Amino acid sequence: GHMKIKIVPAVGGGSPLELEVAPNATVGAVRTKVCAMKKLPPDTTRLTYKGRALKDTETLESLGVADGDKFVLITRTVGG
């Protein structure tokens, strides 16, 4: 099935994202999709969930995500 998740920037006025995501998708997949939308190199970004640093291969099932939950997107400089 799918759950609705929100992605909000840690800083600034960038738009939040709302994605419908499969529960067997992983954190890394979410980050790939967010970075595709944001036009960002993946390694310039991290996602946190309730403040926690995340392993890319967590599924959203294993992490205990629920419909409506939010991840925070932390970004860095992009010229490296």
Residues near 66 by beta carbon (within 8 Å), at least 6 away in sequence = 3
80 annotated as belonging to a binding site for a ligand? yes
CA distance 33 to 79: 20
Kindly give the residue spans of alpha helices, DSSP state H, lying in 1-80: 27-38, 60-63
| Annotated binding residues | 80
Return binding residues for Zn(2+).
Answer: 80
